[PDB]
UniProtKB/TrEMBL annotation:
Protein name, entry field: Fatty acid binding protein 5, epidermal
Species annotation: Mus musculus
Signal peptide: none
GO MF annotation: an example: fatty acid binding
Family: Belongs to the calycin superfamily. Fatty-acid binding protein (FABP) family.
GO biological process, one term: lipid transport across blood-brain barrier
Every Cytosolic fatty-acid binding proteins domain range: 8-25
Highest taxon, organism lineage: Eukaryota
PROSITE patterns per the UniProt record, alphabetical: FABP (PS00214)
Record keywords, A-Z: Transport
Amino acid sequence: ASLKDLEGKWRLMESHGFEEYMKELGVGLALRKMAAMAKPDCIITCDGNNITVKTESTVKTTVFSCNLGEKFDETTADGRKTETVCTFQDGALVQHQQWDGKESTITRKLKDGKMIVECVMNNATCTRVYEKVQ
Ligand SMILES: CCCCCCCCCCCCCCCCCCCC(=O)NCCO
Ligand SMILES: [Cl-]
């Protein structure tokens, strides 16, 4: 699996543990239900080391653009202001966020033609499965 393998337009097909993950993040109920219901597309572009992740929905669209391994300031879809580093490790794009002495990691990996997005914060894990839009 490679970084360029992640590039493209992706649609959410399956989600597990998302609500609990968002609660661990501190997302309130109203916002949680909105997030869970509006099921996005995630557009990723990989121009060399320069990685852009755009998450699009009818309710909110967020984008970050980073260089691999360089720390950057991210404003997340729920409004957290984090310091983030993306790395590439064992076939996965690893996005590590830190804010308020807390941390979360989001891993994106191509498995069997699908993008698997694993989100961890503390004891709360979320798995989200995306498929490539034709
Ligand atoms: C999928 C993005 C959430 C939908 C966009 C926000 C919609 C409503 C606005 C605010 C509600 C906040 C929802 C959770 C935001 C960030 C949690 C991590 C999302 C993520 O990377 N999730 C892994 C999949 O990319
Ligand atoms: Cl930002």
